[PDB]
Amino acid sequence: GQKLKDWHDKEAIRRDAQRVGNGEQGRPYPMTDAERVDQAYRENGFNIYVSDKISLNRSLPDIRHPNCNSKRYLETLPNTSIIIPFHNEGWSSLLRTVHSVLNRSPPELVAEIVLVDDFSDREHLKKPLEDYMALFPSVRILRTKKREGLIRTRMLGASVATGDVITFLDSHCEANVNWLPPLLDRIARNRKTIVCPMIDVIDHDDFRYETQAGDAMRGAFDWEMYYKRIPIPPELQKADPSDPFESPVMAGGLFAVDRKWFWELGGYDPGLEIWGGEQYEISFKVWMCGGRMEDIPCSRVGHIYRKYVPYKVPAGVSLARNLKRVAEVWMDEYAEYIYQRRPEYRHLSAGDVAVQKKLRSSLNCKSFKWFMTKIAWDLPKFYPPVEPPAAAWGEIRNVGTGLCADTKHGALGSPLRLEGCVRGRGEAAWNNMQVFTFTWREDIRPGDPQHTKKFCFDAISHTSPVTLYDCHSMKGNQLWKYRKDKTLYHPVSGSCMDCSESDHRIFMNTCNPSSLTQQWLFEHTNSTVLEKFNRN
Template sequence: MRRKQKRLLQAVGLALAALVFLPNVGLWALYRERQPEGGPGGAAAGGEAQGSHVRKRKEVYFDDGQRKKDWHDKEAIRRDLECTGNGEQGKPYPMTDAEQVDQAYRENGFNIFVSDKISLNRSLPDIRHPNCNNKLYLEKLPNTSVIIPFHNEGWSSLLRTVHSILNRSPPELIAEIVLVDDFSDREHLKKRLEDYMAQFPNVRILRTKKREGLIRTRMLGASVAIGDVITFLDSHCEANVNWLPPLLDRIARNRKTIVCPMIDVIDHDHFGYETQAGDAMRGAFDWEMYYKRIPIPPELQKPDSSDPFESPVMAGGLFAVDRKWFWELGGYDAGLEIWGGEQYEISFKVWMCGGRMEDIPCSRVGHIYRKYVPYKVPTGVSLARIRNIGTGLCADTKHGTLGSPLRLETCVKGRGEAAWNNIQVFTFSWREDIRPGDPQHTKKFCFDAISHSSPVTLYDCHGMKGNQLWRYRKDKTLYHPVSSSCMDCSESDRKIFMNTCNPSSPTQQWIFEHTNSTVLEKFNRNLDL
């Protein structure tokens, strides 16, 4: 009896030992698997090469079976931290009075004198959320074709864009960089650019045969892309630390995700690099279709603010998309001119077709926001310079303040596109009003008239037609349906006012220069003129 009890106790003891010991064997094996060789619990000798340690430490297995790694290039980051000089670490360049002259901005809309004095390989501050340093991304990521359209871009700003991509991207993830020249006429962008880029085997240059505008130029680049993913960037950007893997990781997990980096600001004067006000915010738009950035609602905020978050619409210029998914969406509407509005088209199609839009806080790219648009806009957009037939003078918004009357001034000639754009360009909008400025930089003032004899003033655009509704009639008069009168002017005091319509009066006849006839027809829709 005692012998049986003894055997029973031994069996129970062995069972208990197995329950305690065997699970820990499994945990120990898992621990060993996740340790770098040569590290704590590793089998490698302490003398193993340091490079191997770094490589092994980046590899981790997760429960979903997908292998991840740390994509940071620690050596490149260390080198950047040691850089000193003009603009290094993204610091503002100390400008002199001689470097702030108008000529510095005229060709590019930013200070090219300063840009030329900053290294093409300049270092940038790592202003990401600290948690980004510890994030791991899929070991197997798709490669990408980076599409960079440009038109008469500055030499140093274009090259700095390319260098920043090459310097801060894992080489195996860059299938190619495609520079698409939209009919530039500056000499430095011809053979000189081709000779320079010949040193980079994965950079190629395409050229349009006529001025196409941003959208069709992007489409040309996308049509020849060989990468799994298409990444669109502007030609005056600077990619920051580890910018690419966070974008490609999200697409690798869901090919119907379009991802955008955080867009930082490179100052157009001194080229200082800093985050946008408010930093991580969602894209949105108001009832007038103006793009805005708004705070993320508290209920949608992530516990870790460095994690990706959904956004209704993107800013438009900088994003990555699965190449096949881009064409499944139909690409861009090729009828879009120059730029502006394309971000809504893509964003709406993504949501309607079962995709998603995400902003990625751990991916950051700096962008120069121009002081003004420096290049000529070809025929085909809804822009006009409004010239009076009777006086030969042009409508002008030189004073351009709320409530100020519209006046006539000598038509600007030979003073550069900056002056022309600022005071004598107007936009016909789908709201059937007329606004100063080009579609991207138009002020929120509209031509406004309250009666058949009132002056024409600039007033806050309300989008409700009424006092701000205009028609351009076949007799070249600008008709105001609310007051049943036409825009008139006085050569003596250069005032613009409303008057009883008289098609035979030359001071009531206006020429709209540089305007797409199709846009004008849409502007006059639903009215037999």
């Protein structure tokens, strides 16, 4: 019998809505010079002074899709073991995670909450934590005998879980309203599906709660294996935008997976060290070996992204080794695409993978080719295994002032000023960066077309100066056009690039294929590409 149910705790929603105080409803914390010190970050990578001044039960805004409130799920669902690994995690941030789980998860559906201590040295994580958690029956603390790392530490928790499905959560999260039922329901219908809630951001400074940019998006990666998020192609967008949707890769820290299914895949590669790579291993595993992976818009959990890594990592440990172990076992021929960018990965021992490779074959999995072609088919659109050639690169000299486009190596956000051309015959004492590349993405970024920087030419209005704002693979305000009239057309602003003849900064203005201050010249080119997106 599929007797459904409305798992919403209307009263709790009312009481949470009626809650008042600093940080309530997810609003930012009223920052003061006291909380703005640098010692407030030293321990966690996020503001612990602010965290301490916010209630461990603070309320959060319900930013779910309007349809989510209407959804209903199976009256009978499988119970879950919530595993939370931690290492020298802050006191309040950890307690807020557990409270959110306790107060926003139907007790009946929670078999147990297991906090797994990864050899923590912070004192508040010892007796105090124990006495405090002893007051909550469903909570249990498990400790490793030495530093094991998040991967193995999550494995420890998984090896003891008694619930039907294992739900993983980082130690600095905050479950939002009615987040668990929609995850359990999905796995109840498809045991081999791994599910991920939408991961929302909890600001490391004022702790405000808000969705990541772009909201519902597909997971992916660049060829250096940095996690990326790309938009859902129109042909994949569900009728009801609140419905479960496929994701090729998970962020890694928040997901639920049937316990039995989890071990059938072999959990995680025990060889993965402190951080990195397990998200790729497990994601490739679920798809390639018979399962699936889905993001559940109706389930949302806040997560605090660190401003920097506080803990320490043992000697002789790098992300490279983890990644290498993942590439060799599951990435087939695509692993090569990784080495062509990071050559040290070739003659770099990835340890013994024999055991792992044995796992893959015993599962009868598809090729990684299959994964790239049928699952992550949109990934190469933003991160092509082999990047198309650039249109133009070199120095950008303005016909008018005769000067060159330069930048005082201002990576943050210093306008694209104008300086006397160096041409490689200059002194590095004056700090001259006059090399640029008009990449295949129709954007302009400093450096050689082979050693470009993640900084693009971003312009707001049709008069503001150019900027080296972070590059976002979107033809937004980083979309340029180099026409035969020697001008850098900005379609999203309808204006062109100009510069004050009085030897001043470079700023947008009214286009004019007759002016000299708007006429630019690159050192090299490839008209075959300049004829690409210049016509409709």
